[PDB]
Amino acid sequence: ATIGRISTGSKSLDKLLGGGIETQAITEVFGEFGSGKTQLAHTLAVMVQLPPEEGGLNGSVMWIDTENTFRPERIREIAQNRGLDPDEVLKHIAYARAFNSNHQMLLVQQAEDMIKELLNTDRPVKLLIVDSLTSHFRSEYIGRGALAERQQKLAKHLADLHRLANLYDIAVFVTNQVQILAHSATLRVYLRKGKGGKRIARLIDGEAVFSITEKGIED
């Protein structure tokens, strides 16, 4: 299958990304607390539901939340302010809270069932969010010996996510709170606060600038 692209809501960020976030890929955003990672996730969960000529994929969403940071009313606000029905947009987000890293890993395997179910509907899953990818791993795997163990478990989790992205033509979008370790996302985006309330994004391994607004994010 040909890759699809999802607009982030920001023309600046879309250009940095080569045209939006890609299906058949894991895009990791990383940065300090407050850098806007979860706001971008909320915005993408709306944008993907737009038709293709508007920057979406007519897609549904699966969201794995490890920090209780998903806000249904933020989805509804972004949707309404972009001209979409807030309740229809929210309904197309399947939502699960991951209680620990082992549950998080099972939830990714479990997501395949709904992905298959929806694959030939008019709104197949096109975006899978894990927010936060790393928080449970960081809390659970700590101290001498934990680097190798945590990295190996994360590698398996990321392999599972890569398979879903690649097999079912889904964009996987993950967040990581930061600030030497290896990473296996296909693309890593460093996010930080800038002047005037702006957020600045840089590809890791130019910079885009955007604001967090009632439309989610925009230039």
Ligand X SMILES: c1ccc2[nH]ncc2c1
The footprint of ligand X (CB under 6 A) covers: 62-64, 94-96, 107, 110-111, 114
DSSP for 188-201?
EEEEEE-GGG-EEE
Which lies closer to ligand X via its Cβ, residue 70 or residue 141?
70
Which lies closer to ligand X via its Cβ, residue 95 or residue 149?
95
Minimal distance, residue 194 CB to ligand X, in Å: 32
Which lies closer to ligand X via its Cβ, residue 107 or residue 208?
107
List C-alpha distances in Å: 35 to 26, 94, 191, 215. 19, 25, 6, 17
CA distance 99 to 101: 7
Which lies closer to ligand X via its Cβ, residue 21 or residue 61?
61
Minimal distance, residue 130 CB to ligand X, in Å: 9
Minimal distance, residue 63 CB to ligand X, in Å: 6
Task: Give the DSSP letter of residue 53.
Answer: G
**The residue type at 35:** S
CA distance 207 to 169: 27
Minimal distance, residue 82 CB to ligand X, in Å: 23
Which lies closer to ligand X via its Cβ, residue 50 or residue 130?
130
Residues 6+ apart with CB under 8 A from 217: 8, 9, 10, 13, 36, 39, 40, 43, 199, 210, 211
75: nearest Cα among 34, 115, 51, 47: 47
Minimal distance, residue 108 CB to ligand X, in Å: 7
Instruction: Determine which helix (DSSP H) or strand (DSSP E) holds 216, and give its type and residue range.
Output: strand 216-218
Which lies closer to ligand X via its Cβ, residue 66 or residue 211?
66
Instruction: Determine which helix (DSSP H) or strand (DSSP E) holds 105, and give its type and residue range.
Output: helix 101-118
Minimal distance, residue 40 CB to ligand X, in Å: 18
